[PDB]
RNA sequence: AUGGAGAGUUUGAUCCUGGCUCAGGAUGAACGCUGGCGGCGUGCCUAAUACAUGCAAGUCGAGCGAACGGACGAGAAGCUUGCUUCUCUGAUGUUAGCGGCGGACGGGUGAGUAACACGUGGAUAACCUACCUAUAAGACUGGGAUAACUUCGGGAAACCGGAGCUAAUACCGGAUAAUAUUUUGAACCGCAUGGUUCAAAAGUGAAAGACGGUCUUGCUGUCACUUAUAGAUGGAUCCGCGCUGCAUUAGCUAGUUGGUAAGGUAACGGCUUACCAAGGCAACGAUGCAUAGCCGACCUGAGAGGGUGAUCGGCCACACUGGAACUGAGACACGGUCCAGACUCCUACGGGAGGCAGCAGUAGGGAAUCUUCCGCAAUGGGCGAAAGCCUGACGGAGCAACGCCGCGUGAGUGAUGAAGGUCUUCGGAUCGUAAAACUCUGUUAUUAGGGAAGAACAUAUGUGUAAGUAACUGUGCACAUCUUGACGGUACCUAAUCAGAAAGCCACGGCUAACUACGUGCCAGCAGCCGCGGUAAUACGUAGGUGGCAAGCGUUAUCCGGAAUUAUUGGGCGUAAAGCGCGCGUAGGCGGUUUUUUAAGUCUGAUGUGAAAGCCCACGGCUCAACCGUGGAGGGUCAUUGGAAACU
């Protein structure tokens, strides 16, 4: 099943995460389907979430599942709140 | 690094400028056992070497820091022979030496080593920080008064152009990139660039 | 979608509903840049032994109908 | 070095292949005679065919046989009948 | 050598320790004005020992720092 | 358009041809000498050789029987009036089994394969797809069985081989609905053919668990269930081109090439088997032998082009060697089975077992490549409502100057002859502002305090809100409380003390910037080239100098460049190497002038694509730099679509 994940980039003791909708059987740093945006815990103060929310909702409506940290990323912006209004309508 | 005598290197090259002059004591030709003799004339590869050494031992560098700061001068639109001159005086060795915080270059390099600068904020203790145009260079608040620091400001005047200086905790500014006029033209940059062409 | 629409020239009409066209085009050489003609015998599926030797035949690709023929006939521009 | 899960999978694949070949030979037998009963214009040319088409998708809703070999067998019976 | 082929190998230096059956490390490099030998021997690698008294070009010929 | 240099060497002396040898870059490098650190990387290239030991795939009691443990209602009382003897409501905990799902991913390796393996662009009106998401329709009624357990026999064993019981979301029987399938009609295409209503006959499912409220009930929320559609995904087959060296490999095929049938495959098909026909491929290199996983990329080059596949990604292939099938959505399966083989191991000799090209490690090979470490805290994966467990993936620690980039190893002064050691036309020029000794700094070293980001969650329990309900739990969403951290008392920051302890390495003829003196006297030896040594050696050996640059230096190996010494750009053939001894001619290559014409080549503009990472450019974060991140040249290779008509 396709699921939105975190593929880590960056160096040692400096994690940088790009957020990625990909299949669950591909490796972590391996082949992807589409790269939604980034995530950076080790910046100055913020996490610096960049998400193109018009495209992240194209995957959540046909089977992509956030896994416990991007579900916090999407809720930090507000994609998961706005996800209900497609189901409510 | 070098750690040796700048007197001997000023004998073989032009000058290292510890004081105002250093070659007047012995023969100004060459240091040891063949100096006071008939100076055999010197080929083109030698003279493309000697002016490179006169610039390297001036700032007190070594190769593959002198070479790795050469091809990154081949990135801007100016003349490559003098882009290498202008970003070589923008280090925290020349800027501490130019706006006078020391009577010479080596203890100016030793001043930026041990952490007496706090440039533009917290600290840069590296002696190869290329200073961007327009941020201040100070002295550390823990050590504002030393025998080395203050008693070398008053002797050496003429803080050069595209700089500032003050007595309010010794704060230079580094206005912009200096010109070839405001850079020591005792060593010609027009023949060092052919050494790295080979 | 649509399938490839090659044109050619028959070489040997043997028995049992098969002809082989000869699509000739011009690959260029890699290093020297000279054009050079080369051939490619494409087996194709005649319906009822229609086309004879000497004809120029327009063909189209299809699903694999045998071990070596992959193409079908559509139209005959000229014959002999 | 057998991991302790694979020693249980070899057990449950012998238990599950005995149930398969009992059912899978029954589907091949019940079409071996119904295809014979489509020939000869016999009595049960509409009763063994209803039994054969029954068993070839008892074994297709379960994963004995695929759901395109099921439709291929039941078309080879019901066209000729 | 390790592969079962025969060569001839020069010994640089002054004195050597090469009676027979010794294990030595063959270095490449031809020595001219000598027929049929085009290899050196690393002086000081496995069983050959360094020269007795060099202090000038000391790394090659393989002797350690005195005192 | 930031883009191109050379030198030495044939001769008594030139010019030319021509090879050779250097100066420049790199590496999974090795070796010799030497060696304070720090940050990021990298580290069996050989033997796809054999492997001791741990250890990498498990999970679910909310699928259900059993078991085991034990609180809690726990009698009479052995009177030791609290020890439980047993009895129990059994809360609740743990597992050996049955069962579901996962073991096909992640991880390793490059032996095989010159091939639709791969790259690129297409095609499937010849395809399959568990979980996930969405939409509807359902979940009815019965049955028997078998592990566990009890008992027996073989075996010291471990496990077989019997006998009798038991449960389920296990298995099985029967009802009920399909757009499947087979018969008959009306559209459009690109050949078989499709799509979308129709209308007739046969055919086919199933699961309950843990909640909620109230009716001794009957609806009910959560997520399993199976049925049909889609979407998303992953997979398969086919096709155009692009794919190493040999012609001192020129005939390859015989289910081979078509046909018509039949089987069978998810699917088309010589995929297989029958008959019928004699085709099929090949100098545009069939075949055969040899070599090699391919590509992004990396290295080099002014480009053209050459070289490589370590690391990091995509794909393929393999899992001691060779066949085969099972289970399943998916395998013909790396820590699965069966068979054959070669090795290896235990043994009470009765028969049992194992496959590091997973992670460290061992032996062996080798010039050469490391710890039998810590942790699931991060990210990812599996199974679960969930807590959570398992994860040698991964995150870290250790060793190695293996590479890159940073810092060091201390200067401000001042006898411009203190000592002493080279050279000396000995008077002096050198080492030398070198150096003792005077004044300060402490990067770092060490001890001694402080100390962190990575860390946001899930989960519980509270408040809303949305869907839904008769209502409430619950669910979706929103916030806000508290929860956990291998690295690690690490990064780092403050003080205390000391010029303490922290440089070698190769060159000195000329290319090539740096030389004098003793020793030795064709000897000992040097040498990249030319060449040095026979008594005055700037080339040997040492000593004082000096220079290249430095935690490295030098040698060797290999690759590209210099090499215009394979020349399309960009060479030649009178005598330097090179015109067949000349004809006739096949294939091929090339071909006079004009008009009309088409659009293959050609040119031009509309798209689409050539993933990410890197290269180039611009910013951001590392105290700078290495490095890391983001935004751009941009895909220029190709395919689809319009046009232009001179030149082939």
Kindly state the tokens that stand for A22: 């990909």
Kindly state the tokens that stand for E51: 């020269």
E strands, E1-67, where?
26-28, 39-41
What are the Cα distances from residue E4, in Å, to B131, E7, E40?
A: 63, 10, 18
User: Which nucleotide in the DNA or RNA is closest to residue A39, CA to C1'?
Assistant: F629
Dist CA A51 CA A80 (whole Å): 12
Do residues C19 and C57 make contact, with C-beta atoms less than 8 angstroms apart? yes
Question: Which chains reach chain E with 3 or more Cβ–Cβ distances below 8 angstroms?
Answer: none
Smallest CA-to-CA distance from A49 within A39, A58, A63, A60 is with: A39
Contacts of B136 (CB under 8 A, 6+ apart): B119, B120, B171, B172, B173, B174
From the CA of A25 to the C1' of F330: give the distance in Å.
13
The alpha helices in B104-159, defined as continuous H runs, are 106-114, 147-153
Measure CA B42 to chain center: 26
Dist CA C5 CA C7 (whole Å): 7
Q: Render the burial of A49-88: b for 16+ CB within 10 Å, e for the rest.
A: bebeeeebbebbeeebbbeeebeebbeeeebbeebeeeee
Q: Render the burial of E34-65: b for 16+ CB within 10 Å, e for the rest.
A: eeeeeebbebbeeebebbeebeeeeeebbbee
Neighbours of B128 (CB within 10 A): 15
What are the Cα distances from residue B39, in Å, to B12, B54, B71, B155?
A: 11, 19, 34, 37
Dist CA B147 CA B158 (whole Å): 20
* Bridging pattern class, strands C71-78 and C41-45: parallel
Kindly state the tokens that stand for C16: 């049992």
Q: Is the CB of A28 under 7 A from strand F?
A: yes
Do residues C71 and C20 make contact, with C-beta atoms less than 8 angstroms apart? no
Neighbours of B130 (CB within 10 A): 13
Kindly state the tokens that stand for C35: 């054009």
Do residues B67 and B88 make contact, with C-beta atoms less than 8 angstroms apart? no
Q: How was this structure determined?
A: cryo-EM
Quoted resolution (Å) = 6.8
Report chain F positions within 7 A of protein CB atoms. 2-3, 5, 23-24, 31-35, 39-41, 56-59, 97-103, 105-107, 122-134, 171-173, 180-183, 190-192, 202-206, 226-228, 231-234, 237-243, 256-260, 263-271, 276-284, 304-305, 312-315, 326-330, 333, 335-337, 354-355, 365-367, 378-382, 393-397, 404-414, 416, 422-423, 429-434, 439-443, 453-458, 466-467, 476-479, 493-495, 499, 503-507, 511-516, 524-531, 541-551, 553-558, 568, 588-590, 600-602, 611-612, 617-618, 621-625, 627-630, 641
Entry field: residues in chain E:
67
Which DSSP string do the residues of B50-119 spell out, in sequence order? HHHHHHHHHHT--TTTTTTTTTTSTTSSS-HHHHHHHTTSSSTTHHHHHTTSSSSSHHHHHHHHHT---T
């Amino acid at each position: 099943a396709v699921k939105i994940r975190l593929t880590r980039l960056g160096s040692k003791r400096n994690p940088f995460y790009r957020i990625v909708v990909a299949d669950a059987r591909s490796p972590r740093d391996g082949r992807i389907i589409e790269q939604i945006g980034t995530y950076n815990p080790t910046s100055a103060n913020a996490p610096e979430i960049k998400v193109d929310e018009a495209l992240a909702l194209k995957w959540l409506n046909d089977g992509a599942k956030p896994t416990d940290t991007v579900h916090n990323i999407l809720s930090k912006e507000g994609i998961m709140k706005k996800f209900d209004e497609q189901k409510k309508a | 690094r070098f750690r040796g005598s700048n007197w001997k290197k000023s004998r073989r090259l032009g000058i290292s400028l510890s004081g105002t002059g250093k070659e007047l004591e012995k023969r100004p030709y060459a240091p040891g056992q063949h100096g006071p003799n008939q100076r055999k004339k010197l080929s083109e590869y030698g003279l493309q070497l000697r002016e490179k050494q006169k610039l390297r031992y001036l700032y007190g560098m070594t190769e593959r820091q002198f070479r790795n700061t050469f091809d990154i001068a081949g990135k801007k639109f100016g003349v490559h022979g003098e882009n290498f001159m202008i970003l070589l005086a923008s280090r925290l060795d020349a800027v501490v030496y130019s706006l006078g915080l020391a009577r010479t270059r080596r203890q100016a390099r030793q001043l930026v080593n041990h952490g007496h600068i706090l440039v533009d904020g917290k600290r840069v203790d590296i002696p190869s920080y290329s200073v961007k145009p327009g941020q201040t260079i100070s002295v550390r608040e823990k050590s504002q008064k030393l025998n080395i620091i203050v008693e070398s400001v008053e002797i050496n005047n003429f803080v050069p152009e595209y700089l500032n200086f003050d007595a309010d905790s010794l704060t230079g500014t580094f206005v912009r990139l200096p010109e070839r006029s405001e850079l020591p033209a005792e060593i010609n940059e027009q023949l060092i660039v052919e050494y790295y062409s080979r | 979608n649509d399938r490839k629409v090659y044109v050619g020239k028959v070489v040997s009409d043997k028995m049992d509903k098969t002809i082989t066209v000869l699509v000739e085009t011009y690959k260029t050489h890699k290093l020297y840049g000279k054009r050079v003609k080369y051939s490619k015998k494409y087996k194709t599926h005649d319906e009822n032994n229609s086309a004879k030797l000497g004809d120029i035949v327009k063909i189209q690709e299809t699903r694999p109908l045998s071990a070596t023929k992959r193409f079908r006939l559509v139209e005959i521009v000229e014959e002999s | 070095a057998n991991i302790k899960s694979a020693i249980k999978r070899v057990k449950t694949t012998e238990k599950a292949e005995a149930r398969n070949i009992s059912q899978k030979s029954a589907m091949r037998t019940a079409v071996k005679n119904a295809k014979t009963a489509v020939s000869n214009n016999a009595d049960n040319k509409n009763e063994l065919v209803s039994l054969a088409v029954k068993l070839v998708d008892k074994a297709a809703q379960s994963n004995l046989i695929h759901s395109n070999k099921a439709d291929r067998i039941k078309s080879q019976l019901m066209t000729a009948n | 050598l390790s592969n079962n082929i025969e060569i001839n190998a020069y010994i640089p230096g002054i004195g050597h320790n090469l009676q027979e059956h010794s294990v030595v490390l063959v270095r490449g490099g031809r020595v001219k004005d000598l027929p049929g030998v085009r290899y050196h021997i690393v002086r000081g690698a496995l069983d050959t020992s360094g020269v007795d008294g060099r202090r000038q070009g000391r790394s090659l010929y393989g002797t350690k720092k005195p005192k």
